[PDB]
Amino acid sequence: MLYLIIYDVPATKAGNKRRTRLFDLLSGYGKWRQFSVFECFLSVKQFAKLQTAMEKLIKLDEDAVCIYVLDENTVQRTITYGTPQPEKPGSII
């Protein structure tokens, strides 16, 4: 149920909008790891609230994305070196 997603999109004033608006989105559904990267651990119904948001906005003739679905026993073995590994607790400030 750990949805990892990517975006790699041109510098068009018509698509550069789509990038910067999409970053404004994914920070709303998940966390940031890399420039073209968000790691979103979340439930399912929250997905269609999301899936319905991207299929609703993109130009597939000019855009590029792929998606990955990761469960825990597939998550634990994501060895990393310069960044910490994912986790999703309640947040405190």
Binding site: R21, D24, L25, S27, G28, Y29, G30, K31, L42, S43, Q46, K49, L50, K88, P89, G90, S91, I92, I93
Partner: protein, 325 residues
């Protein structure tokens, strides 16, 4: 499932097209605007009375997000809730039964039976010989009025609190609990937990569509909700009351409190932030639901007991409260 807490009274929340941005720095920079998601959250708690964008609030309640308000000390003050439930038939029986005490009694005996037991079966967790209480637990059943009972809970509570110092140790002092300001530090910690406990309870009622202001113990004649406290009572002793003893055996032994202008033993900042780690840790617990093998968390059990309670009212089901040995 991933809750949000706020301590800083200088933090502003705005909406950026689908999500939140917190601004902390306070003019040593550009306020350190840190983005945050909402679409994963199910609850919020605000203590330092921070500023919020109104345009943002209306976005949380388009999502089903309660908003809770507290003070630096942790006392409950109020909460802002999203769209409610439309089951009047429920709330009618909630009342049609409130004026027939015969029903009210057959119920409260359960809340307390499931509450005082929660204590004796707790003290055995901690290792206390007798603290004679099951007699008192099963005493209730030989009663037939309310006034007979409210004095009893206060007694078991007084019997529950006099067994307290010996269970803590020598570092702290506790003889009893005061409705006062916390003349004692720990009681302030309880007003903190007992104060913030309404947060998860005040929501579950909003889920079942129940009226918090109509209860069975606290007669709604002091302007205090009662379905909450009548329900909140079953949990004061095992989650917020077990939590404190879980941190005062490892953490915050002392040095992390502050007293000022009243005695008024307030807490220190950055100690509050450790306090909640155990609270959501506690609410990330399983306990397997010792009725069935449900294995529900504490956090959910409240939503459950509330929904369960409506069914006691519409479907006539039994309400076996939570007891753990």
């Amino acid at each position: 499932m991933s809750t949000l807490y706020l301590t800083q009274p200088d933090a502003v929340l705005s909406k950026k097209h689908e999500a939140f941005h917190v601004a902390l720095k306070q003019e040593d920079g550009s306020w350190k605007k840190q983005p945050i998601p909402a679409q994963t959250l199910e609850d919020i708690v605000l203590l330092g009375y921070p500023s919020i964008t109104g345009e943002a609030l209306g976005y949380a309640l388009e999502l089903g997000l309660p908003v809770h308000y507290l003070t630096q000390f942790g006392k409950y003050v109020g909460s802002a809730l999203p769209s409610e439930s439309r089951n009047g038939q429920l709330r009618l029986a909630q009342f049609r039964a409130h004026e027939d005490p015969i029903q009210r009694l057959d119920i409260v005996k359960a809340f307390v039976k499931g509450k005082v037991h929660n204590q004796y079966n707790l003290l055995y967790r901690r290792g206390q010989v007798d603290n004679p209480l099951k007699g008192r637990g099963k005493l209730v059943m030989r009663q037939q009025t309310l006034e007979q009972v409210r004095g009893i809970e206060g007694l078991a509570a007084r019997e529950y609190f006099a067994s307290w110092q010996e269970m803590l140790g020598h570092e702290w002092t506790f003889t009893g609990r005061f409705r006062r300001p916390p003349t004692d530090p720990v009681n302030a910690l309880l007003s903190f937990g007992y104060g913030l406990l309404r947060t998860q309870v005040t929501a579950a009622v909003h889920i079942a569509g129940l009226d918090p202001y109509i209860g069975f113990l606290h007669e709604t004649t002091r302007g205090q909700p009662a379905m909450i406290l009548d329900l909140m009572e079953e949990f004061r002793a095992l989650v917020a009351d077990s939590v404190v003893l879980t941190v005062l055996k490892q953490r915050e032994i002392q040095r992390q409190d502050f007293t000022e202008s009243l005695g008024a033993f307030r807490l220190t900042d950055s100690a509050t932030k450790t306090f909640l780690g155990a609270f959501d840790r506690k609410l990330s617990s399983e306990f397997k639901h010792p009725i069935f093998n449900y294995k529900c968390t504490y956090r959910r059990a409240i939503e459950l007991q509330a929904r369960l309670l409506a069914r006691h009212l519409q479907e006539g089901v039994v309400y076996e409260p939570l007891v753990i040995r």
